[PDB]
Symmetry: D2
Subunit: 372 residues, 4 copies
């Protein structure tokens, strides 16, 4: 069975998404369904037609509403900047389309809520693209935790450290503009870590945070204001009694895409570093005392999703494989008439955690995270 | 834009990696040198062939590879079969005036490989052997440092390829363990990748001195004998006067896809580990005395091929990106009427090196490597 | 010149300190002064006598006051549990003796204050034994920072993760009893990280903390743990940087994992004591195609390198940190100078700990009093 | 019991040796015996007196013969360059002293044979100072192998890679002079790896090697010739049927004290890197399939020698602890009327391997390695 995709935005995530739709059935065969790259929307006709050629779409448009109104489109895939997520998803939901939307779901908790409300009562699959939790090593961590293999979780530490804008001469873009992005590091990269904490540990009860801006204006490439955070650090109380912290920054020289976590359980520990994403480190307390420590486990056929990936460990997982697994599970949900995680429910919950972090930093005090 | 019809022969492991490369290359390298059309796939029987076409997105399928050779509208023949069919298929393709990419090793013996070289060497066709690991961005970056003189003159090279997927004696007797099909075991299957790297980064081999080992002499079928090497180690004299060694094995517990090198130059060193392929390690002698050592460099836009890959370092290179780069350079050679490296000339030189290694092991002496 | 040492405590730190006194001049020659292991005190005569023979002291005693009252003694070295730090240090200061005291300085801010007040108007050398800041790699980090090589510091992350007590059957030693220890992970190990932060970044302005006890009772029949197993705190530095420190006794796979990561405007530095020979430094100024963390092995080219091993990676262990400590302590004494960290630093750390405890109790930011 | 030590030479090993004697009882208590730093010899009386003060020796001399002839000296510790090991050890053995000698035992197999022949019938403890095998990680690897925990050994790889002389302006010290040193990288650093190979895998059956000199002259401490190898690589056939190789060099930028090995067994693998000596990496085939790989094990109380070292893993092993452990075992053998490994027998076997490597390199052929009993 074919599912006709309408992809809105042909930039960085347009590419990664197009790769996923091209490759997914090659990896996961027989596929839950066959993606058809039907129409791509971009900001003007020339951009759109060029994107269609590059990414292999059958049609282009400069008006995304023409995708919403097309009765032959089954999936709407939102790959635009954060300011258009809600308007597009809400239209798509009203037209009864399945939706994958890039993170953060929207710019604020309130805007995210409207998207969740728009889908929560329809029999459509809705997904927020936190692809990093589908790194096989992160799925392997989940497996170990659910089996009890590290016991009860005490403590979680999570980072997302980057440096692509660590230079003040690096130009202003929508990622530095509150009106567009909603927040800086918090929305752009801390949300990936937060989803990861929710996935592996559980729901957040409360946060206590500090937001920092290090580079308050950038050249327009003549300068404009950066009115978002460059860096966030937050302590966390988890609803199950665990404690933790998350730190994200755009200003860590030497750190490129350093999404990490360290989890301490009563019977073991798990460490992950996405810069070496093929590896998961796991220390089991039950190891004999003279041979006890972290094992470096390379993901392959024996680990979650391994049947759909490469025939030996360390043949190498890249960014693409994570989007491929994401597309697979999205399509599986559609084909099976089920739901997928993370959904717009997960999207909205994160946006509420973001609001709580901002409020916490403003008031310099603990803030309870409202639940869903 | 120029569209080239590909006939792929084999829909196994490399059939998948190759299909991914043909679907993805234009998305990464845009504007593309030419657009691959997945036109026909050949497999061992008609049911296999049709299923592989559905899986890998080929328009047509056949159980007979000759029908690809004889089809005037196929521009590219891509040989992804086991080693016993490389020569017959490439020689047919050459005679039909097709561009050819052939999986490594080029064939089972030096003499088979020579017949393939002789068939293409005086034709105006692009011919390539699929030593894709040299197109890991980290390896291309190593080449850049070297050719720039940034580590000075090369003194010594150490290369490995350590695996463990058949380290269990109950792993069965596939074609890779059968000399009549494979030609050799670890030597032809995995040492050739390291030998190609050594030729690319250091230069031509002058002599070798080797030991071949078989640790598991019989396996279950699907009982039968293993008549190839499980492991090879060889010393090398390079024609430029550097020294080195290469070691490959199927029997190193904990080693998954551990293709590595370490190069010592007069002014620096380079160390590469494919299990962490995003990284190149480089130590420059020119560093100030109190801040000298190996730098871990993560590949991205600033490094070779980076313009066609991901927007920041450590977003993550996998196996697929190496095949995408290989496909890009193959197609660029075709579009531009040039040649590509490594070619059948390279494939044949490596077959001669393997033969010299076998001779060496048998005679327990240094053997000069014949030049093509 | 000889400096006569009176060492109080013959346990773990007794052994490390005795090693430092025995080895320091072999390493740093000519030496600032020659340590004489003159008297070791222990808790009873037989322990003391055995400790003097094991550690090579001229004399033993089962009464630490015999050291204070011995006019031959130049140096009092306090290697007892935390409850005796204050009374011993104060008596030694009143006797005009140079003092090194193990961390934490005392059990609380107030007890620490008494120790500081006893030395602050004197010119004796007083030192608190935060020896991890004298790992050569950490001193290297300080050098890079002071040179401006990573620019201005924005952010600090520090850990001390251990697991020696992660098993609930691990017994109720003095480190788990508030009356003796003062606090748990916070006093015992987080203080090393706080010291490193103060050394590399600067003074703490405010803290916001959470304290956790995971294992509330232990075999002595059992008894209650009334200290923290784990602490995490956010930090505002006086200079405007931000950071955090995390320490725990409950991290399976982590043995002596005292680490930091510093983000400056022109570079980053990472250190991991479990691989203490290494310092990781990333300079923004690296050419754009060869930029990232370089792993620097400490040796002759690096701070303290003239007194250590002749090549990098010959190997620094725990003892070398203590030897360097002793070296600088004795150099201060012999020149009539002061040493860092002093009891001023020890007391400042003790104020930071009190602010951390207070912060955790009140679940709010607390300003750190300055001495 | 007190054992009087006469140390000959107060250079770099003088210091590490003096540390071992001063510290060993603090770590391993009760001690087998108490080392006494009685007399140190150096090459002139001013050096000797200065060394005695630096290293805490009671007495000094400029004539090491006065240590041999001193009836109150129990232990002779030879820490000179390679050219004096033999003359000193042979005189100490004839005088009935216990002996620890620095590696390599002597300059050649023949000279090493003389040393072994002088001790093998005497009732003395004799030791060659291959201290790196007493890194606790390496002792741990021995434990795993002897237990059968990685099965039968198929393959061994060892390196000793350094760069302290990778600048050709680094001066022509004795280490670059064949007449003093006997060989370059081979004798100075490959011998440590060869000892580990013997200890962990077994005896060598044959070798096939290449020796390289990259920098053929250096400034004198005007220039002189370097007439030793900078670099060695050798393939190995082990007597038990395992294969392997060893590589050592003075010319590897970024490598400081990179003594490593990788061992492949039928049921697991072991990897060690001295630049991170606190760690041993071990991969067990028996791990469940979804949690299988190299474990990074930090050495401490649970591991060999752990009762004498630090109370938790990763408090930190440095070079000195290896010398302490070495002195512990040496004194233990003296105190118990026993012997220790590696002895002059082992020293001589290594010198024979070196000779075979040299010969192999010159003939470009496999050379069988004689056993010390031949
Ligand atoms: N899951 C992940 O790992 C990542 C997610 N993201 C998210 O993906 C989304 C897109 O980010 P990037 O692709 O990096 O941004 P980008 O700036 O590379 O591309 C966004 C594209 O949106 C197009 N666009 C703008 N207005 C439009 C309109 N009215 N109609 C059609 N197209 C329009 C632009 O022309 C541009 O090409 C963002 O929400 C971002 O937060 C971004 C990077 C990674
Ligand atoms: N460059 C690299 O990194 C790698 C290269 N290789 C090489 O690729 C080649 C294929 O290896 P794999 O894909 O691993 O083998 P495979 O066994 O996974 O697949 C080979 C396929 O060839 C098909 N085949 C056999 N006879 C055929 C015929 N007459 N016509 C059409 N198809 C036929 C089989 O049905 C099978 O599906 C080999 O030469 C191997 O050495 C393999 C793995 C990796
Ligand atoms: N890296 C570092 O700087 C470390 C510092 N420490 C600190 O060192 C101090 C001692 O710790 P450890 O040596 O590990 O404890 P420990 O329990 O090993 O030894 C303490 C010794 O003090 C002795 N003692 C008790 N009362 C005494 C008295 N009245 N007179 C003489 N001796 C007495 C005990 O008999 C015991 O042998 C503590 O303040 C601790 O916080 C401990 C470990 C490491
Ligand atoms: N086990 C290990 O890890 C190491 C072993 N070694 C070995 O230890 C030995 C000494 O090497 P280093 O200490 O590095 O050399 P060095 O050159 O630092 O010291 C040698 C000392 O021997 C002294 N000496 C020379 N002739 C003498 C005489 N007739 N009487 C008394 N002393 C005399 C010299 O004055 C010099 O101070 C060598 O055999 C070397 O191969 C060296 C370094 C490390």
């Amino acid at each position: 069975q074919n599912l006709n995709v309408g992809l809105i935005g042909g930039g960085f995530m347009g590419k990664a998404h197009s790769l996923a739709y091209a490759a997914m059935p090659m990896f996961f065969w027989p596929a839950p369904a066959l993606p058809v790259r039907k129409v791509i929307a971009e900001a003007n006709p020339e951009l759109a037609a060029e994107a269609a050629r590059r990414f292999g779409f059958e049609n282009s448009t400069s008006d995304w509403r023409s995708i919403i109104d097309d009765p032959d489109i089954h999936v709407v895939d939102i790959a635009t900047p954060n300011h258009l997520h809600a308007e597009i998803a809400i239209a798509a939901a009203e037209a009864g389309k399945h939706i994958i939307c890039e993170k953060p779901l929207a710019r604020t908790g309130e805007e995210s809520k409207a998207m969740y409300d728009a889908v929560k009562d329809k029999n459509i699959v809705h997904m927020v693209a936190f692809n990093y939790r589908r790194t096989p090593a992160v799925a392997l961590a989940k497996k170990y935790i659910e089996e009890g293999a590290i016991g009860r979780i005490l403590s979680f530490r999570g980072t997302y450290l980057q440096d692509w804008s660590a230079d003040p001469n690096s130009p202003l873009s929508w990622r530095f503009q509150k009106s567009i992005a909603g927040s800086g590091a918090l929305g752009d990269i801390a949300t990936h870590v937060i989803d990861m904490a929710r996935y592996l540990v559980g729901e957040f009860s409360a946060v206590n945070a500090v937001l920092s801006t290090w580079i308050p204006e950038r050249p327009l490439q003549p300068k404009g204001p950066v009115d978002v955070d460059d860096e966030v650090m937050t302590m966390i109380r988890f609803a199950n009694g665990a404690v933790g912290s998350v730190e994200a920054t755009r200003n860590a020289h030497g750190r490129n895409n350093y999404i990490t976590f360290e989890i301490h359980g009563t019977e073991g520990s798990i460490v992950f570093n996405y810069e070496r994403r093929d590896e998961l480190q796991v220390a089991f307390a039950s190891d004999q005392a003279d041979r006890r420590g972290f094992r470096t486990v390379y993901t392959g056929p024996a680990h979650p999703y391994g049947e759909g990936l490469w025939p030996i460990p360390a043949l190498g997982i890249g960014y693409g494989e994570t989007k491929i697994i994401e597309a697979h599970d999205f399509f599986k949900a559609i084909a099976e008439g089920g739901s997928v995680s993370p959904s717009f429910a997960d999207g909205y919950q994160v946006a509420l955690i973001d609001d709580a972090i901002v409020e916490s930093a403003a008031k310099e005090s603990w803030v309870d995270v409202p639940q869903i």
